[PDB]
Curated annotation (Swiss-Prot):
Name of the protein in question: Cathepsin S
Disulfide bonds: C13-C111, C23-C67, C57-C100, C159-C207
Portion of the parent chain present: 114 to 331 of 331
Gene encoding the protein: CTSS
SUBUNIT field: Monomer.
The organism of origin for this protein: Homo sapiens (Human)
MF GO annotations: collagen binding; cysteine-type endopeptidase activity; cysteine-type peptidase activity; fibronectin binding; laminin binding; proteoglycan binding; serine-type endopeptidase activity
EC number of this enzyme: 3.4.22.27
């Protein structure tokens, strides 16, 4: 059923790693990264979507606080409510709160709905990553080892299932045995392995990677 390893970069479904700088917008980058994959899947076009759009426009109605943090799930809801999100090129990232400047002329994607996965279920997360696409997740990124990660599979004994940082699961596999989740971060290419971190998989919901997963969908009609 499920492949032993998945890497959605292999299908050209993952945009370049972004750099959030001095702005707590990991939640926005995680959300656009998940939708970028669906847009390529459904239309063949890979285009970076506007995290700034979310920072500026998905605000108090969505419990989001711009550069002070927010949630992928309600980011998706904003995109649904708004009937669109702009391309990154048309609405570029400035790493600060701005007035909402959404322009339907430059809408690059929509969202029909989003699905939240059950808490801590790494088997269900694996199936979604394999069968649906990259999944937005929160992790516990509070511990210094996360900041210093360079290579290998990340395991932090002090990690908890309480999450405060948004990332994108773009695959999974095993490094010489050691099972991992392939995680796209938004701290630029100088973080980890060219912007990516392999996070311990199947170790009791390590760092909360499976605590609050979600993914959006762009539906093609229905029956
Ligand atoms: C405690 S819990 O784990 O139990 N859990 C509690 C329940 C929960 C959590 C997450 C979740 C899932 C995924 C992510 Cl990614 C995040 C997050 C986050 C986040 C992202 C960024 C920042 C902060 C937090 C905190 N501030 C940071 C900041 O300001 N910075 C400025 C200085 C430099 C950068 C940092 C930025 C949170 N979903 N749900 C379920 C839906 C919760 N409903 C969502 C709609 O509304 C009402 C609440 C957290």
């Amino acid at each position: 059923i499920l492949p032993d390893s998945v890497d959605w970069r292999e299908k050209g479904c993952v945009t370049e790693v972004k750099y959030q700088g001095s702005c707590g917008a990991s939640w926005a980058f995680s959300a656009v990264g998940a939708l970028e994959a669906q847009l390529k899947l459904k239309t063949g076009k890979l285009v970076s979507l506007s995290a700034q759009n979310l920072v500026d426009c998905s605000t108090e109605k969505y419990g989001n606080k711009g550069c002070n943090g927010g949630f992928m799930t309600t980011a998706f809801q904003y995109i649904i409510d708004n009937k669109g999100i702009d391309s990154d090129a048309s609405y570029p990232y400035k790493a600060m709160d701005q007035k909402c400047q959404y322009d339907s002329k430059y809408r690059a994607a929509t969202c029909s709905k989003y699905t939240e996965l059950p808490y801590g279920r790494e088997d269900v997360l694996k199936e979604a990553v394999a069968n649906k696409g990259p999944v937005s997740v929160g992790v516990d990124a509070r511990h210094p080892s996360f900041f210093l990660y360079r290579s290998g599979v990340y395991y932090e004994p002090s990690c908890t299932q309480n999450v405060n940082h948004g990332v994108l699961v773009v695959g999974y596999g095993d490094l010489n045995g050691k099972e991992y989740w392939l995680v796209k971060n938004s701290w630029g290419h100088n973080f980890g392995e060219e912007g990516y971190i392999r996070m311990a998989r199947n170790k009791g919901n390590h760092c909360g990677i499976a605590s609050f997963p979600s993914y959006p969908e762009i539906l093609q009609g229905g029956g």
